[PDB]
Amino acid sequence: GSRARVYAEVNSLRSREYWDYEAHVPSWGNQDDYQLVRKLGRGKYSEVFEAINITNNERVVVKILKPVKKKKIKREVKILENLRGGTNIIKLIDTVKDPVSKTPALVFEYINNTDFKQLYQILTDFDIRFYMYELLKALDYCHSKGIMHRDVKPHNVMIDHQQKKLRLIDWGLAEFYHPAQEYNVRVASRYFKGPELLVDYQMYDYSLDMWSLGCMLASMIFRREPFFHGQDNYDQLVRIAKVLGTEELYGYLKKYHIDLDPHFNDILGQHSRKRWENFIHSENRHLVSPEALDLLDKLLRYDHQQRLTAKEAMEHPYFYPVVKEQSQ
Ligand SMILES: O=C(CCC(=O)NCCc1ccc(Cl)c(Cl)c1)NCCCCn1cnc2c(Br)c(Br)c(Br)c(Br)c21
Numbered sequence: 446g447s448r449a450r451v452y453a454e455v456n457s458l459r460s461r462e463y464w465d466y467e468a469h470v471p472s473w474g475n476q477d478d479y480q481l482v483r484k485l486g487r488g489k490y491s492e493v494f495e496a497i498n499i500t501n502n503e504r505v506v507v508k509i510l511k512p513v514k515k516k517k518i519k520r521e522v523k524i525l526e527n528l529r530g531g532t533n534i535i536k537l538i539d540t541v542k543d544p545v546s547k548t549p550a551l552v553f554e555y556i557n558n559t560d561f562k563q564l565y566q567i568l569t570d571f572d573i574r575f576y577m578y579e580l581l582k583a584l585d586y587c588h589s590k591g592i593m594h595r596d597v598k599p600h601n602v603m604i605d606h607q608q609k610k611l612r613l614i615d616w617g618l619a620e621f622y623h624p625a626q627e628y629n630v631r632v633a634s635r636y637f638k639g640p641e642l643l644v645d646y647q648m649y650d651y652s653l654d655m656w657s658l659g660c661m662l663a664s665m666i667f668r669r670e671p672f673f674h675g676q677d678n679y680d681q682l683v684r685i686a687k688v689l690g691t692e693e694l695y696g697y698l699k700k701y702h703i704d705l706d707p708h709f710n711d712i713l714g715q716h717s718r719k720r721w722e723n724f725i726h727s728e729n730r731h732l733v734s735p736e737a738l739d740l741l742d743k744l745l746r747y748d749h750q751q752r753l754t755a756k757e758a759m760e761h762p763y764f765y766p767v768v769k770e771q772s773q
């Protein structure tokens with residue numbers, strides 16, 4: 446069976462308490478120290494507000510959780526605690542409850558979420574390299590901590606383009622990696638789902654996040670956002686196969702003994718693998734380089750186990766200008 450190439454044993458080498466989130470007992474502080482100022486977003490299991498800590502005037506973000514998901518709350522809390530101090534991971538300041546209702550909430554550091562008003566037109570080639578490198582630091586960190594994010598997408602990446610700060614948010618779908626464990630494929634968001642999810646392959650790993658990363662890189666350098674625009678989960682795989690090829694998909698399935706839902710036979714068609722240069726034109730040529738294409742080609746691979754790790758991606762020549770500026 447399939448196994449991560451990196452970080453495969455790291456949870457088993459740690460104390461059980463590190464990964465046994467069901468046994469975790471958070472310490473719940475007092476939400477009454479926080480004044481909600483403005484709604485920032487809302488999801489199936491939470492709602493997010495900008496807030497002030499009235500005791501010290503600190504601006505923060507409060508994610509109020511639907512309380513019935515007790516196991517899922519412990520999971521997210523323990524993951525965030527394990528990731529404390531990780532580079533470019535959103536900082537969990539505290540875990541609090543309304544002291545009367547006991548509804549739990551998470552308090553995060555505030556970030557300026559730049560409102561990109563022109564579909565990222567303002568970001569240069571160097572900016573894309575710089576922020577991709579920052580995002581990869583977060584993914585290498587969490588993977589090294591035995592955790593898969595499982596919902597990497599633009600919505601979950603805060604960038605303060607004033608201060609050049611990046612944070613990976615929303616750890617509510619994240620999960621500990623244990624070799625040979627079969628995971629639920631109902632994770633990630635449609636456009637960022639790896640082929641393994643779309644073909645119902647449960648034995649996936651950190652490399653799922655690297656597919657999502659690759660989708661983001663393709664959309665940044667080519668300016669087609671999202672890059673793979675499925676109308677539903679079936680069509681999502683078709684959109685991928687139109688680029689990566691159908692014979693190539695079947696070789697992946699064969700390698701891992703993956704059964705394909707037969708509804709796909711009526712919609713996949715026959716598609717030759719496309720050269721990445723096909724996506725270049727006058728509107729994106731300034732963001733595309735041989736290095737970018739080589740990196741992308743090594744991320745957007747069917748075979749999860751052969752995709753670059755976050756560290757291998759960071760070590761690619763595409764990021765040499767960032768590293769050199771980071772030291773010069
Ligand atoms: O608008 C966004 C981000 C959109 C966006 O384009 N990104 C940048 C993506 C990007 C772009 C270029 C590159 Cl090259 C790279 Cl790598 C990545 N997402 C919706 C916000 C939801 C509100 N929301 C929820 N939870 C929050 C938390 Br927690 C905090 Br803290 C804060 Br602040 C906010 Br706001 C929170």
Ligand SMILES: [Cl-]
Nearest residue numbers: 620627628629
């Ligand atoms: Cl799962």
